[PDB]
Design a protein around this ligand. Structure first.
Ligand SMILES: [Zn+2]
Lengths: 130, 57
């Protein structure tokens, strides 16, 4: 894709949850094409300020729920703590397994979105806050 | 009979996970639409989905 369309109230809520969390937050962006219609936070089973891994049971329940609603996974979101919202090498491997839009945010309210092409090259994607 | 979701590409379940590039800690599997554990027996005509655990930092 080339651009992420996300409603303001969802983006503001993600930033607020992140602003007061001591560990990395993670979740799904569900919708159609490039547009976010639903958000699901998922437990970070590492409970860590520097890495995240989704609870597998919560993840699967969320994907099955979205399937019932006829929604695609538009993207994944997660937070960084005390560093800018740029994909890390750790993010690179997860983006290979889930090659959708990756929204990264931090506790200072910064956010950027990224995508991994078939040539395994990352490019930034523009965000429109709806 | 092996669909890995995310990229959306199409014995016991531990071997079918290692056969497609994962282990029990990095993916969750469901057979015929039902969750299964690592040493659960796989049958010849069943349908398996491999769900990579989203991770990063
Ligand atoms: Zn990251």
């Amino acid at each position: 894709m080339s651009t992420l369309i996300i409603p303001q109230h969802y983006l503001r809520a993600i930033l607020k949850v992140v602003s007061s969390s001591s560990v990395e937050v993670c979740g799904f962006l569900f919708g159609k094409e490039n547009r976010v219609l639903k958000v699901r936070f998922i437990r970070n089973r590492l409970n860590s300020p520097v890495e995240f891994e989704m609870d597998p049971e919560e993840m699967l329940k969320a994907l099955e729920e979205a399937e019932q609603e006829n929604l695609e996974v538009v993207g994944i979101f997660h937070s960084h703590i005390a560093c800018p919202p740029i994909p890390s090498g750790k993010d690179l491997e997860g983006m290979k397994r889930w090659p959708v839009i990756w929204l990264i945010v931090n506790e200072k309210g910064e956010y950027k979105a990224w995508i991994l092409s078939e040539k395994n090259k990352i490019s930034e994607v523009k965000i429109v806050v709806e | 009979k092996v669909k890995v979701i995310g990229r959306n590409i199409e014995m016991k379940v531990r071997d079918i996970l290692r056969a497609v590039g994962f282990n029990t800690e990095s993916a969750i599997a469901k057979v015929n639409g039902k969750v299964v554990l690592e040493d659960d027996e796989v049958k010849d005509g069943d349908f398996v989905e491999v769900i990579p655990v989203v991770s990063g930092g």
